[PDB]
């Protein structure tokens, strides 16, 4: 048994991304021990949709995509197939036929700051909902009034990204939650990601 997948570089990362610019890591050409995640006591939310959790060590997929971001506590329920919200529509959309596992844990001791941590943003305004697994990092001004809003911010021209204020004294549901979405997708290329033998 050799060359374990670098889940430590994804779950234990120092700096996570915001949900409008969520990071994607292509876990491939390695062997993955998923049961060191399922038996970890740290994860508050662990929901696997297309696949049973204990069967992950036996099924082989050709690659896994790990999408990492930081959201609010009350917004965790929107990271699911078929849910609707600000995050589901304009930040991160899961497909209805989603196979994979959504893992989320409270990171109030890391991403919160006493003066507020404004490094985490989320898209508030968009003309239409995102397609599943679509990335939108455009920071252009939002034309809300259809006046000749020629780029300049002002009345009826909103900045599309709102900042999550994160403070350690916030209640549960306003505290930051780190979310990693593992999407095991199986193209008919030869499979390279398996469990331990």
């Amino acid at each position, epitope marked *: 048994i050799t060359n374990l997948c670098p889940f430590g570089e994804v779950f234990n990362a120092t700096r996570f991304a915001s949900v409008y610019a969520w990071n994607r890591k292509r876990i491939s050409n390695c062997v993955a021990d998923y049961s060191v995640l399922y038996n970890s006591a740290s994860f508050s939310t662990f929901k696997c949709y297309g696949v049973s959790p204990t069967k992950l060590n036996d099924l082989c997929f050709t690659n896994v995509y790990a999408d990492s971001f930081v959201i609010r506590g009350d917004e965790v329920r929107q990271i699911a197939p078929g849910q609707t919200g600000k995050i589901a529509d304009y930040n991160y959309k899961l497909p209805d036929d989603f196979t994979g596992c959504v893992i989320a844990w409270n990171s109030n001791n890391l991403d919160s700051k006493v003066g507020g941590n404004y490094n985490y943003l989320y898209r*508030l305004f*968009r003309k239409s909902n995102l397609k599943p697994f679509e990335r939108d990092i455009s920071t252009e001004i*939002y034309q*809300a009034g*259809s006046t000749p809003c020629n780029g300049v911010e002002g009345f009826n021209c*909103y900045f599309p990204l709102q900042s999550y*204020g994160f403070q350690p*004294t916030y*209640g549960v549901g*306003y505290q930051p939650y780190r979310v990693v979405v593992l999407s095991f997708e199986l193209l008919h290329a030869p499979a390279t990601v398996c469990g331990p033998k």
Partner: antibody, heavy 117, light 108 residues
Framework: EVQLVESGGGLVQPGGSLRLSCAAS????????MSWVRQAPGKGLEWVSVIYSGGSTYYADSVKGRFTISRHNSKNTLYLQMNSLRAEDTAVYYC???????????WGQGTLVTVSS | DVVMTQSPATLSLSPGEKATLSCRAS??????LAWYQQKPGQPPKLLIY???TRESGVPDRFSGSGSGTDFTLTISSLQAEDVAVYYC?????????FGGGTKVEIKR
């Protein structure tokens, strides 16, 4: 510059249907968050429904399954269809532009819906 | 759900005084609070949002403070046209709930 003009309020029998319309000027309702907020006579404001910029619709618990918020994009108009109206729905309704269902900077004039036999 | 309580239920102060309206949430709603001013027979007007930031076109005598559960709306100098009902409205929780309202009266 921003105006919200309502119509469709009136007397309706219990169990009836009523279609409130909010025309808008100064902004497009197809790309803005819109809310219907009702106020009982002599009581406080109560949020009824919201439609997002992308088209996602949400309703309060007392009105879920009965009301339907929608909009018709080519004429800058917001609609609220109401079906099976009960006695406690007699209220003044306001259409309000929101900053991402957070706060309502611009409000409609308000129309009264009376539900009685 | 968040039960949003305003105190006092009515307030009568002579003009030129400072009026402090207190609003209290059942949970901690951070700085996700807005204040509205409703004249009789007139739609509500947004005064402040994010519990501190004034709406444009609102005069400088209105201000806000507070965080979490307790919030205050301060009118530094009451004048004649401030006879209205003031609502505090949270938007941190998923259902948007308004307060009970405070009627402000002027002692002439």
């Amino acid at each position: 510059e921003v105006q919200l003009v309502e119509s469709g309020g009136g007397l309706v029998q219990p169990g009836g249907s009523l279609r409130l319309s909010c025309a808008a000027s100064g902004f497009t309702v197809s790309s803005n968050y819109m809310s219907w907020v009702r106020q009982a006579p002599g009581k406080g404001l109560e949020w009824v429904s919201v439609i997002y910029s992308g088209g996602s619709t949400y309703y309060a618990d007392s009105v879920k399954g009965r009301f339907t918020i929608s909009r018709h994009n080519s004429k800058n108009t917001l609609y609220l269809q109401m079906n099976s109206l009960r006695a406690e729905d007699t209220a003044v309704y306001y259409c309000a532009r929101g900053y991402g269902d957070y706060y309502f900077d611009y409000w409609g004039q308000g129309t009264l819906v009376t539900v009685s036999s | 759900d968040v039960v949003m309580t305003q105190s006092p239920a009515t307030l009568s102060l002579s003009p030129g005084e400072k009026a402090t309206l207190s609003c209290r949430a059942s949970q901690s709603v951070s700085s996700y609070l807005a204040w509205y001013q409703q004249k009789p027979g007139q739609p509500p007007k947004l005064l402040i949002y994010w519990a501190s930031t004034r709406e444009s076109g609102v005069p400088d005598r209105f201000s806000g403070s507070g965080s979490g559960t307790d919030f205050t709306l301060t009118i530094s100098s009451l004048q004649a046209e401030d006879v209205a009902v003031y609502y505090c409205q949270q938007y941190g929780s998923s259902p948007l709930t308004f307060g009970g309202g405070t009627k402000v009266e002027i002692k002439r």
